Each structure stands twice: as structure tokens, then as C-alpha cells.
Amino acid sequence: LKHFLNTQDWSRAELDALLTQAALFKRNKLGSELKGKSIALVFFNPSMRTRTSFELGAFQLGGHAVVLQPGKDAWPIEFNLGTVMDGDTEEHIAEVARVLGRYVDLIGVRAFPKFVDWSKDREDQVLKSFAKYSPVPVINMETITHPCQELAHALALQEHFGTPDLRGKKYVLTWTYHPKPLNTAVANSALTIATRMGMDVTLLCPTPDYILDERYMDWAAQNVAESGGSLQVSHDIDSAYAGADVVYAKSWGALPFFGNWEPEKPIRDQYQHFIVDERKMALTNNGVFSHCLPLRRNVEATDAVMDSPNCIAIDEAENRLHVQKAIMAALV
Amino acid sequence: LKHFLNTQDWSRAELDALLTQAALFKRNKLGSELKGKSIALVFFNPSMRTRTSFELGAFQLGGHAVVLQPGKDAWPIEFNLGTVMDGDTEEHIAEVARVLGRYVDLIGVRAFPKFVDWSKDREDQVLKSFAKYSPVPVINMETITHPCQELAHALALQEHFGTPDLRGKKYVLTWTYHPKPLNTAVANSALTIATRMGMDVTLLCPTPDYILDERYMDWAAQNVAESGGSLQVSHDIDSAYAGADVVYAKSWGALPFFGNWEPEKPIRDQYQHFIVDERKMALTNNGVFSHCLPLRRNVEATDAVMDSPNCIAIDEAENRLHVQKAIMAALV
Amino acid sequence: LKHFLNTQDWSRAELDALLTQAALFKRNKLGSELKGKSIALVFFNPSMRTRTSFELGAFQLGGHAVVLQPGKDAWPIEFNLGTVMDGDTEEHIAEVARVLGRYVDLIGVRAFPKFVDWSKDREDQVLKSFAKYSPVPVINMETITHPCQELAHALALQEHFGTPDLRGKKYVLTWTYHPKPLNTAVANSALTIATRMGMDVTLLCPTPDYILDERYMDWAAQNVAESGGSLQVSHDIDSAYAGADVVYAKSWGALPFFGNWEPEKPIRDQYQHFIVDERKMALTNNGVFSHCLPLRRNVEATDAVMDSPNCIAIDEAENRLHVQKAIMAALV
Ligand SMILES: CC(=O)N[C@@H](CCCNC(=O)CP(=O)(O)O)C(=O)O
Ligand SMILES: CC(=O)N[C@@H](CCCNC(=O)CP(=O)(O)O)C(=O)O
Numbered sequence: 001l002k003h004f005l006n007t008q009d010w011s012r013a014e015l016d017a018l019l020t021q022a023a024l025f026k027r028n029k030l031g032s033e034l035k036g037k038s039i040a041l042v043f044f045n046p047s048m049r050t051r052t053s054f055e056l057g058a059f060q061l062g063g064h065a066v067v068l069q070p071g072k073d074a075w076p077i078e079f080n081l082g083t084v085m086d087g088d089t090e091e092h093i094a095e096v097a098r099v100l101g102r103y104v105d106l107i108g109v110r111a112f113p114k115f116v117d118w119s120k121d122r123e124d125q126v127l128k129s130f131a132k133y134s135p136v137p138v139i140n141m142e143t144i145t146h147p148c149q150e151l152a153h154a155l156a157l158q159e160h161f162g163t164p165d166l167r168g169k170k171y172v173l174t175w176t177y178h179p180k181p182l183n184t185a186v187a188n189s190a191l192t193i194a195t196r197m198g199m200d201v202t203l204l205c206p207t208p209d210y211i212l213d214e215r216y217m218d219w220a221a222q223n224v225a226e227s228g229g230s231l232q233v234s235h236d237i238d239s240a241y242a243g244a245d246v247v248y249a250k251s252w253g254a255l256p257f258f259g260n261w262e263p264e265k266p267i268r269d270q271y272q273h274f275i276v277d278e279r280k281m282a283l284t285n286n287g288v289f290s291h292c293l294p295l296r297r298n299v300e301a302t303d304a305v306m307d308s309p310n311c312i313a314i315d316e317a318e319n320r321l322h323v324q325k326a327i328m329a330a331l332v
Numbered sequence: 333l334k335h336f337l338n339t340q341d342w343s344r345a346e347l348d349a350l351l352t353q354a355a356l357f358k359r360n361k362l363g364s365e366l367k368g369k370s371i372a373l374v375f376f377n378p379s380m381r382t383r384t385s386f387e388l389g390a391f392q393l394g395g396h397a398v399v400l401q402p403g404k405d406a407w408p409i410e411f412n413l414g415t416v417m418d419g420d421t422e423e424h425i426a427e428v429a430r431v432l433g434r435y436v437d438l439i440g441v442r443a444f445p446k447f448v449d450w451s452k453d454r455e456d457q458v459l460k461s462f463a464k465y466s467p468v469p470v471i472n473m474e475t476i477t478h479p480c481q482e483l484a485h486a487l488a489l490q491e492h493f494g495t496p497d498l499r500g501k502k503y504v505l506t507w508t509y510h511p512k513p514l515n516t517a518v519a520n521s522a523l524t525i526a527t528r529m530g531m532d533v534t535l536l537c538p539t540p541d542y543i544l545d546e547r548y549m550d551w552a553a554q555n556v557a558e559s560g561g562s563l564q565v566s567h568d569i570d571s572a573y574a575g576a577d578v579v580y581a582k583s584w585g586a587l588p589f590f591g592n593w594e595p596e597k598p599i600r601d602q603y604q605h606f607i608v609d610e611r612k613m614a615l616t617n618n619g620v621f622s623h624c625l626p627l628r629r630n631v632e633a634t635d636a637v638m639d640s641p642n643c644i645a646i647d648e649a650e651n652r653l654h655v656q657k658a659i660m661a662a663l664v
Numbered sequence: 665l666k667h668f669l670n671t672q673d674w675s676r677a678e679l680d681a682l683l684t685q686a687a688l689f690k691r692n693k694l695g696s697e698l699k700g701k702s703i704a705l706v707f708f709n710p711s712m713r714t715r716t717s718f719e720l721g722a723f724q725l726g727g728h729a730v731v732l733q734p735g736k737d738a739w740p741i742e743f744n745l746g747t748v749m750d751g752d753t754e755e756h757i758a759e760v761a762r763v764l765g766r767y768v769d770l771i772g773v774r775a776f777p778k779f780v781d782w783s784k785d786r787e788d789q790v791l792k793s794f795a796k797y798s799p800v801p802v803i804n805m806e807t808i809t810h811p812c813q814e815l816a817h818a819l820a821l822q823e824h825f826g827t828p829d830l831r832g833k834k835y836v837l838t839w840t841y842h843p844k845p846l847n848t849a850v851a852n853s854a855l856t857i858a859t860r861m862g863m864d865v866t867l868l869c870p871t872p873d874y875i876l877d878e879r880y881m882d883w884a885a886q887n888v889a890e891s892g893g894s895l896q897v898s899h900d901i902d903s904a905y906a907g908a909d910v911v912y913a914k915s916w917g918a919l920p921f922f923g924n925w926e927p928e929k930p931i932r933d934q935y936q937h938f939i940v941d942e943r944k945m946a947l948t949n950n951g952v953f954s955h956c957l958p959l960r961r962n963v964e965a966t967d968a969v970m971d972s973p974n975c976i977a978i979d980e981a982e983n984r985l986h987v988q989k990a991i992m993a994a995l996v
């Protein structure tokens with residue numbers, strides 16, 4: 001059974017096919033690829049674009065999406081094995097995935113880390129459990145990676161430059177400020193797809209404590225050696241931005257501080273100058289700027305940058321709809 | 333771009349066309365006016381009829397409604413401009429409206445005042461922001477006015493009297509009791525449409541403190557001079573009800589007490605006799621009674637009045653579906 | 665007007681017709697029985713299978729389900745008559761049911777007891793009120809009985825044994841452990857349908873305090889005399905399980921302790937050995953095991969039992985979709 005858990009699991013040819021089908025769907029939005037079919041959208045965390053785009057995507061292809069929120073409307077779910085369920089969880093994922101598999105044709109799942117212990121969060125237990133027990137394809141709607149975002153982002157870049165080949169472009173993945181410590185998922189995914197696409201990637205972050213999990217740094221290294229791109233880490237803003245063709249910003253909590261955030265608060269607070277403003281963008285090669293959203297204006301990026309004609313964030317957001325339709329079509 | 337924010341923004345001819353299309357849709361509920369199209373229903377407050385009628389209306393016309401609740405499932409939204417978003421809000425309406433505009437064909441928004449400062453609530457910031465940033469038509473699902481309710485109400489009245497021309501009828505908009513201070517929206521809208529329709533309107537309320545915002549009293553004055561109706565404020569129950577053809581009740585907090593409600597509590601509590609009962613309705617010219625709902629029985633109106641054959645509240649509620657379908661059809 | 669409140673209200677012929685239509689729908693899932701029609705799914709409590717199966721069932725038959733949660737998105741509802749609504753409830757069921765009746769073609773309602781006073785909960789006020797005031801058919805999505813579960817369960821059994829005739833089979837309805845006191849609905853329904861089907865039923869529970877309400881014991885007695893089955897209560901595990909063809913487990917709070925649960929805690933806690941494990945199932949005649957779900961593994965039933973080929977819980981869960989489609993088709 002084929003699932004869409006990570007782009008890293010897919011061959012470059014398969015990903016190129018997905019991006020092309022996405023472009024095709026963007027030209028002809030209504031279809032029958034999902035006629036009479038359905039997808040269960042399981043959300044363990046908030047969402048506006050993901051829920052809306054998947055729900056509309058299902059509708060536009062003749063199917064139907066059922067939106068579920070365990071702990072809210074649906075019953076809370078247990079993922080650990082062999083435990084005595086006398087706690088807060090009401091049922092086990094074994095039953096949840098098997099039951100949904102009798103109803104729907106696809107299952108999407110969104111589950112952010114708990115931010116208590118990265119050793120536990122990095123195992124991707126929720127997503128892996130759905131893929132293990134589900135008799136139908138499972139789609140990652142964001143856990144510790146965000147593959148749907150990767151493709152929406154990639155398509156937006158190929159559209160901007162007018163070509164599917166992004167090799168040679170200088171890509172800057174920069175950490176940015178935020179009052180709270182967030183998920184590294186989008187950053188992990190950006191690093192992954194940017195290198196898979198063969199760009200010259202620079203991971204710009206405040207300190208070594210903000211470097212991404214080795215798993216993704218390794219994927220990136222492997223992707224560069226295969227795509228012909230490059231990878232490097234930087235703690236110097238001006239050098240990183242210089243000559244950049246693309247700048248993608250995202251805020252995330254330092255992995256070393258999982259379960260111990262109050263000491264990280266003062267640390268991030270002394271780097272709010274990482275905010276993407278006109279000055280930094282002016283150092284780029286008339287580069288484009290994007291963000292996965294939701295975005296806090298004048299915190300992660302300034303009003304000027306967001307409203308500049310070089311910001312393609314709205315186009316990338318729109319593309320979530322198109323690439324997800326390609327993903328669902330491919331899996332059914 | 334044409335939006336449906338207030339009936340006051342529309343010409344009488346346009347409103348008559350809407351009411352006629354609504355009557356047509358009531359005769360032939362299924363259609364293809366929204367085939368393959370979608371509407372985002374953004375709710376910042378509770379709703380039963382509005383969510384249900386819009387959702388079903390979209391379905392019946394071949395489209396699909398996506399229901400969103402910022403702060404619940406969707407991310408909280410910032411509306412103020414140029415501020416540093418380090419608070420509770422996660423994203424700005426500029427991005428929210430632009431993104432939704434890439435997904436849906438229409439956006440409906442429900443956002444009640446915050447009841448802290450009427451000077452701020454009366455600006456209609458949420459609705460105006462959606463209309464400003466959205467590339468697609470925006471529909472008022474109730475903010476400080478409730479135009480969809482106005483048309484459902486108007487159609488019910490024209491149906492009751494068997495004619496679209498309501499000129500000459502004595503219309504009584506009466507305040508009624510409620511344990512809590514509520515939105516003036518429905519009252520503002522009733523005053524607006526009743527005068528736009530050319531009826532002889534009487535705004536019956538306990539004291540001058542309960543008179544509606546000048547904005548609506550002015551709209552009413554302008555509407556009367558154009559429709560041939562009349563407007564007057566009253567604090568005397570029996571004189572107002574006498575010979576009335578229509579009685580529309582709604583409870584609302586006195587505008588002067590925004591941000592200072594505890595002193596208003598004792599005030600409203602001494603006027604619970606404003607409740608619509610058989611005695612008051614017996615003073616009317618065999619008039620009809622209606623309410624926008626939800627309604628607290630034996631508080632806002634008695635069981636007898638609600639169950640009387642003169643109560644058209646259920647018909648008005650049904651009409652929300654028909655007039656909203658006419659509105660969506662007109663905007664697409 | 666015909667509603668689906670309880671199987672006990674339906675003749676055996678009508679129920680057999682429903683089960684047969686359910687089997688037919690399971691073979692041909694897409695249809696037009698609900699084309700352009702809609703159902704309002706009103707949930708006062710959590711749900712995963714019920715919401716998902718009804719929503720998908722409506723979609724597969726060409727209709728649309730509107731999911732409502734009073735107190736969450738919809739307004740809270742008052743059911744008592746003639747009271748002064750100055751409390752938490754915003755509107756009365758009289759208005760709610762009448763309004764929904766102008767929008768949808770069917771109304772489903774889920775409302776568990778409040779667990780404070782069984783004398784009040786056993787009256788089934790919510791369900792009865794919807795049936796009383798609704799101009800359209802009402803469907804029980806679980807209140808104090810769970811008729812939809814009864815049919816899904818019955819169909820799964822007929823499928824397992826390869827025949828609609830279950831007479832002669834030894835059926836064991838056993839109480840099982842759970843940290844909290846739960847609804848007797850599923851148990852009441854199991855007892856009802858198992859006897860209606862003519863099986864030899866044994867109600868196995870810890871003590872006389874866990875025996876079901878007389879109403880259901882009476883229905884069972886009446887069903888046995890008509891179907892040719894049998895009914896008996898047992899407090900001995902091994903004797904009950906011996907030679908059983910079917911074992912259905914469910915946990916529920918002792919009726920005598922409604923409104924007084926802390927003293928019941930120690931009582932249930934001394935019977936957690938009622939859990940369905942391999943040892944008890946090995947005493948049966950290679951019998952099948954099922955549960956309505958959600959199920960707490962290693963509490964209500966062990967991992968071994970849940971994963972055994974004799975467990976048909978997933979099939980019963982799937983059948984909720986098919987029997988509910990038969991129910992909606994029959995009522996429209
Ligand atoms: C603040 C916060 O927690 N952010 C998330 C955004 C995820 C990407 N964004 C999306 O998928 C868009 P939507 O479907 O509207 O959430 C994060 O940090 O990973
Ligand atoms: C108590 C309360 O806050 N009431 C609202 C009712 C609005 C009109 N009513 C509707 O639009 C019907 P529904 O869509 O079911 O809310 C108010 O006072 O403005």
C-alpha cells in the first residue's frame with residue numbers, strides 16, 4: 001500500500017508526476033478522480049488552509065471529506081501498544097484506523113509534536129500508527145514534516161521562475177522570530193524539498209541550538225549529492241541573504257529545549273531581528289519570499305515584505321489545494 | 333466588486349429582485365447557480381439557522397460550504413493594521429481574506445460586537461476588513477446589522493399579506509426582556525428594512541438609553557422620506573401596539589452601557605414586562621408577531637404568543653434559506 | 665409520521681426489510697435515495713463512527729448531512745415545558761425542531777443521559793421532544809437505547825453465521841470493566857435485539873445492581889415469548905460463557921447509583937476481572953466477540969481477544985453505515 005507520508009519516500013520521477021498533475025488540476029479544477037469517494041481528515045491541531053483546501057479538493061473531484069477532531073467531536077485516541085487504557089484515551093488507533101478504513105478511501109492526519117520530549121515526538125508515532133493500521137492510503141497533513149507544503153512551495157517556485165528545473169538557484173531557509181517555540185516540521189520539509197530540487201541551500205538560524213534534527217540534515221546531504229545542489233548552515237544574516245533567489249522563513253523552538261522552554265524564551269527573544277524585512281530582502285538577487293502561514297506580521301516578517309510583489313506566499317497557499325488533489329488522485 | 337454587507341447599500345430595485353429570486357428559489361429549491369462553486373462560512377459566534385441554511389443553500393445549488401471557526405478549528409485572526417502580532421492572534425486578515433479568495437467563490441462572515449466599547453464595535457471592523465481584502469464577494473452573516481435576516485423577514489411579511497407592497501402597514505419594533513445584554517444588530521436591521529419598505533414604524537423601547545445608534549435612526553429617516561413611510565420612537569407599550577399590523581421583538585443591551593453592564597442589569601430587570609404576551613398582541617390589528625430566534629420562551633415572548641397562528645417566526649426562519657440562496661446567486 | 669426511535673416500535677417484518685436493504689446497500693453503496701435531500705445530525709455528546717457513517721451515508725445516497733453541536737456551534741436547547749428561560753438554554757426545542765423541519769428532510773439526535781437522576785434520564789426527553797415537534801422523521805443516534813447499533817450488530821451476526829435466522833444461538837450480553845460509569849443504552853439495545861431475533865440470551869453482570877432497567881427486561885421477556893428465544897440473568901462468568909455462540913460486551917454504571925457515583929467506584933473496581941480475555945472466550949462454542957466501540961484495550965477486552973479472528977467488531981462498525989442508509993431511505 002502506497003501512502004504519502006514524506007516526499008523523501010517517493011522517487012524524483014513520482015514527485016515530478018505529482019507536481020505536473022497539480023499544474024494540470026490548477027488549469028482544470030473540476031474532475032471525477034474522487035467521484036463517490038471520501039477522505040477522513042483527522043485534525044489533532046488547528047488549521048485553516050489544510051482543512052479548507054482538502055475539503056474543497058475532495059468536493060471538486062466528486063468526493064466528500066469528513067472532518068474529525070479527536071478530543072473535540074470524535075473520541076480521544078491511544079497510540080501506545082499493550083498499555084492498560086484506564087486513562088484519558090477512549091479507544092486505540094488499531095480500531096480507529098481499521099474502522100475508518102471501512103468507511104473512507106483515504107485518511108489524512110495532522111498531529112503536531114507535544115513539545116515535551118523530542119525523542120518521543122521525532123518518532124512520528126501518530127502518522128506511523130495510521131499508516132500501519134489503515135487499510136487505505138494515509139496522507140500527512142503535517143506532523144513532524146509537512147510534505148503537502150513542500151509540493152505547494154515547489155510548484156510556486158517553478159511557476160515563479162517559469163521552469164520545473166530549480167537547479168542553480170540560491171535558496172535560503174531562515175529561522176525567524178515568534179513569541180512561542182513552534183514545530184520544526186515546515187523547516188524540516190523545506191530543507192528536504194529544496195535540496196531534493198537541487199538548489200544551493202543555506203540553513204540560516206541564530207545559533208547551533210536551532211539547527212534541525214540530524215535526520216533532516218542527513219536527508220538534505222543525500223539529496224544534494226543526488227540532485228547536484230549544495231547545503232550549508234549559517235548564523236550570519238547578511239552573508240546568507242546575499243544573492244539569494246529564494247527566502248523561506250519559519251519560526252521553530254530549539255530542539256535542545258524540548259520540555260524545558262522557559263530558558264529558551266530569553267534566547268529567542270534576543271534574536272527577533274531575524275525578522276524578514278526590506279533590508280534583508282534587498283540583499284538578495286531580487287529574490288522571492290514565502291512563508292507557509294499563518295504568519296504574524298511585524299514579528300516573523302514585516303508588512304512591507306508581505307505586501308511586496310516578490311512575496312509568493314498567497315500563491316503557495318493556493319497551491320496547497322492543487323498539489324493535494326494530485327496526491328489524492330494518485331493514491332486512489 | 334459587489335458585496336452583500338447591508339441592504340442600505342443596495343438600490344430598492346436590486347432588493348426587489350433579490351426578494352423575487354428568493355420566492356422563485358422557494359418554489360424550485362434545487363438548481364445549478366453554484367455548481368462546482370464554494371463559500372467559506374466564517375463564524376466568530378454561535379449559530380444554528382445561519383450555518384444550517386447557508387450550508388444547505390450551497391448544497392442545493394450544486395456548490396459546497398466550508399464552515400470555519402477561528403479560535404476553534406481555524407487560527408485566530410488579527411484585524412488591526414501595522415501592529416506587532418505578538419499577542420493571541422496568529423495571522424492577519426490581509427492573508428486570511430486573500431488565501432480564502434484563492435479557494436472559495438464567496439465568503440460569509442459572522443462576528444458580533446465584543447460589548448466592551450461600542451465606539452469600536454460600531455466601526456464594523458471585521459466585516460469591512462473582509463470586504464477590503466477579499467478578492468471575492470463577502471456576505472454579512474451578522475455583525476452589527478443582519479441584512480440576511482432583513483430579507484427573510486421582509487419576504488415573510490409580503491407572503492403573509494399576499495403582496496410585495498407593505499406601504500401603509502403599522503410596524504412595531506419592540507425591545508423585549510432578556511437576562512443578558514445583547515447585540516443591536518437585528519434591531520438595527522429591522523428598523524432599516526421596515527422603513528425601506530415604506531411602513532409606519534414605531535421603535536418601542538423602555539427608555540431613551542435603549543434607542544438605536546444614530547447611524548440607523550438616520551438610515552431610517554432617509555428611508556421613510558424615500559419610501560413614504562414614517563418613523564417614531566415610543567416608551568409607551570399600549571400606544572405603540574395599538575392597531576399594529578406587525579410586531580417584531582428583539583432584546584438588546586443599552587448602547588450607553590457598553591463596557592459597563594452591571595449597572596444596566598438592574599435597569600433591564602425592571603422592564604421584563606416588555607415581554608410580548610397575548611394582552612399586547614390583542615391591542616394590535618390582528619397583527620402578526622415574529623422574532624429572529626433563538627428565542628427564550630416566557631422571557632422575550634410567552635408560549636401563547638409563540639404558538640399563536642399569528643406568529644410567523646418559523647416561516648421567517650425558513651426564508652433565511654431562500655433569500656440567502658438569492659444573495660449567493662446574485663453575487664456569483 | 666414514522667420515526668426510527670427504537671426497533672421495539674417496528675414490526676419484525678419491517679426490521680427484516682431494513683436489514684435486507686442494508687445488505688443490498690452494502691453491495692451497491694452509491695444510490696439516489698436521498699438525492700437533493702438532507703439530514704441534520706444533532707450531537708449532544710462525542711462520536712466518531714456515528715457522525716462519520718451518517719455523513720458518508722447521506723453523501724453516498726446523493727444527499728447532504730449538516731452536523732450540529734448545541735452548546736458548541738449551535739445554541740443550547742431547552743426541553744422542559746412552560747418554564748421561564750432565564751438560564752443557560754437559549755431556545756426551546758419547539759422552535760428548534762420546527763425550524764430544522766423547514767430545512768432538512770430528516771433529523772438524527774444523539775443525547776446521552778446526564779447521569780444525575782435515572783428517573784429523569786429514562787424518560788428519553790430529548791428524543792421524544794424531537795419526535796413530538798419535528799415535522800420530519802427523527803432518527804435515534806443514541807440516547808438511552810441505540811437502535812442503529814442493534815441493526816449493525818444483527819446484520820454482522822447474520823453475516824457471520826450465513827443466515828438471517830439466529831434462533832437457537834446462545835447469546836451472552838456481558839458487563840465489562842471501565843474506570844467510569846457509562847450509559848446503559850448499548851446494553852439495553854443488545855438485550856432488545858438479541859431477544860427480538862430469538863436467541864437464548866444471558867445477561868451477565870457482577871451484581872443485581874447492574875441489572876438493566878425493568879423497561880428493557882420487560883421488552884426482552886415479551887420478545888422471547890414471540891421469537892422463541894430465552895432470557896436469563898447471571899452473575900457467574902464461567903456458566904454464562906459456556907457454549908456461547910456470541911459474546912457482546914459493554915460497560916455501564918449501575919442504575920441504583922445515578923447521582924451517587926463515588927460509592928459505585930469501589931464496587932466496579934472489584935470486578936475488573938469481567939474483562940473479556942482468551943480464557944473466557946475459550947469457554948464458548950468457538951463463539952464470536954463484538955463491542956460497539958470505542959473500546960479501551962486491556963480494560964474492557966484484551967488485545968488478544970480484539971485481534972482474534974472471532975472478533976467481528978470492525979464488521980459491526982462498518983455495518984453502521986449500511987443499516988443507517990437503509991433507515992434513512994425507509995423514512996424518506
Ligand atoms: C503557528 C503554528 O503552530 N503553525 C504551524 C503551521 C503549519 C503550516 N501551515 C499550514 O499548514 C497552514 P494551516 O492549515 O492554516 O495551519 C507550524 O508551526 O507548523
Ligand atoms: C442570543 C443571541 O446572541 N442572539 C443573536 C441572534 C442573531 C439572529 N439570529 C440568527 O441569525 C439565527 P442563528 O443563525 O441560529 O443564530 C443576537 O442577539 O444578535
Ligand SMILES: CC(=O)N[C@@H](CCCNC(=O)CP(=O)(O)O)C(=O)O
Nearest residue numbers: 711712713714715846847956957958
Ligand atoms: C465511552 C462512551 O461514552 N461510549 C458510548 C458508546 C456508544 C456506542 N458507540 C458508538 O455509537 C460509536 P461512536 O459514534 O464513535 O461513539 C456509550 O457508553 O454509550
